[PDB]
Amino acid sequence: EIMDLLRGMDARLQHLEQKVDKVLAQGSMVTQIKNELSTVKTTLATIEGMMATVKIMDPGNPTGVPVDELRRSFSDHVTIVSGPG
């Protein structure tokens, strides 16, 4: 029983060793993801900064082009949501 008490133990143990070497890659990939997501925070802060202060200007009709030609706008109601939805 002692042989049995050792041989399978060593075999399982070697399997554990292999799985452990596989698992230590977790820490590495996880910290790389952490840093990359930190860069995502850095760039998302900038994209917020750019989008917060944006100019929206209506060109108007200073040229005096006839309204017939200017009728380049939809005449059908379309239901779009922004936040609530």
Added chain:
Amino acid sequence: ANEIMDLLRGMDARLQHLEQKVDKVLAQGSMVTQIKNELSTVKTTLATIEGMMATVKIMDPGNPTGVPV
């Protein structure tokens, strides 16, 4: 006799080594917790960006719109 004791001693030592390996692996999860905490803000800020883009798009006078219901 004493050889079986040598074997048991070597196993317990080997399990101790693995035990250090697994407690290190467990300690690795704190920064996973931090990355979850930051993915929180990821979703929040992304939703804010989406909402800003949507309300900018609806602001165009060319296409009449309407809130559902």
Added chain:
Amino acid sequence: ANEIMDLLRGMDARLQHLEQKVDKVLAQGSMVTQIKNELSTVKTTLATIEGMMA
């Protein structure tokens, strides 16, 4: 021949310790499965906004 019993109780003790640490490790793995799901949603909405900007 009692030492054998003493060491055996010791192996049981480190054993329980392995059980608890491995169980919480499984909890960490379950929480990374959550993370996976949320970031999936982040990808979906990012794709939506990429469609919207163009």
Added chain:
Amino acid sequence: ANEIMDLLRGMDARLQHLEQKVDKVLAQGSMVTQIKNELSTVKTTLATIE
């Protein structure tokens, strides 16, 4: 005695189960490759905004 050999067969069976789900943990690597791909896309597309 034999009781502890039986118990240890029990604990190594549980151990094999732990390794079973451990093998399932690594499945995240493809999706994290996808998340890096997301970074690349968002960088390329925020380049357009400026």
